[PDB]
Amino acid sequence: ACTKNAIAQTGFNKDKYFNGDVWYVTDYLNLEPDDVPKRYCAALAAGTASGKLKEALYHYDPKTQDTFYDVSELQVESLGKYTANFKKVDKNGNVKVAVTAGNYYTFTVMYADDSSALIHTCLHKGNKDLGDLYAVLNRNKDAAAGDKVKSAVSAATLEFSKFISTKENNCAYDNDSLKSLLTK
Ligand code: HEM
């Protein structure tokens, strides 16, 4: 179960975050033990497509090679805080698992600037019992976390030393699919 009401960034700039471009997860923190593997790759695109607020996600386990994409329309709870009902799709946007009630994630942007961000998500998926996940994002897949975002991790009362890096997994991303998925 999730336990955090994450606080959105004061003065969050939604148009800059949701500009159609790609964010890479460089470091993550799962609050519950063994919720997720200790080696993992993930990225997203975020933008408005034909007036609709969207995200496209990519997950890849670099050991098992398990891979999946998702597309969601985000609904607004408050500035920087969203609820997303997801559909699993192939990289071209063809539906593999349709939107269904009870399959949704919340998504809070705790900190963002033009290059980096800190987000929280609570995933709900059928009768999985998952816990809070925080992720440091960057526009550059290889970027070490700078002081702006590390300070935000501290301000959230978290220890950056506990976050697991994704950088030693040889992650390669299909940015073109992520951007085109925003329309799907
Ligand atoms: C960018 C932030 C992230 C978001 C918004 C997110 C969202 C999601 C969503 C929506 C699903 C279910 C997809 C589906 O079934 O169609 C999922 C599943 C999963 N995610 Fe993430 N994820 C993020 C980052 C990560 C990271 C960094 C990890 C590290 C391991 C991770 C591990 C997983 C795993 C293992 C599953 C499979 C869950 C299961 O079915 O048991 N995710 N995530």
UniProtKB/Swiss-Prot annotation:
GO terms for cellular component: extracellular region. It comes from the Eukaryota. It is an enzyme of class 1 (oxidoreductase). GO terms for molecular function: histamine binding; metal ion binding; nitric oxide binding; oxidoreductase activity. Disulfide bonds join 2-122, 41-171. Its EC number is 1.7.6.1. Binds 1 heme b (iron(II)-protoporphyrin IX) group per subunit. The keyword DNA damage does not apply. Keywords: Disulfide bond, Heme, Iron, Metal-binding, Oxidoreductase, Secreted, Signal, Vasoactive, Vasodilator. It holds the Pfam family Nitrophorin. Heme-based protein that delivers nitric oxide gas (NO) to the victim while feeding, resulting in vasodilation and inhibition of platelet aggregation. Reversibly binds nitric oxide (NO). Also binds tightly to histamine, which is released by the host to induce wound healing. NO release is pH dependent and linked to loop dynamics. Superposition of the structures of NP4 in the presence of ammonia or nitrite shows a conformational change of the protein upon NO(2)(-) binding. This is Nitrophorin-4. It comes from Rhodnius prolixus.
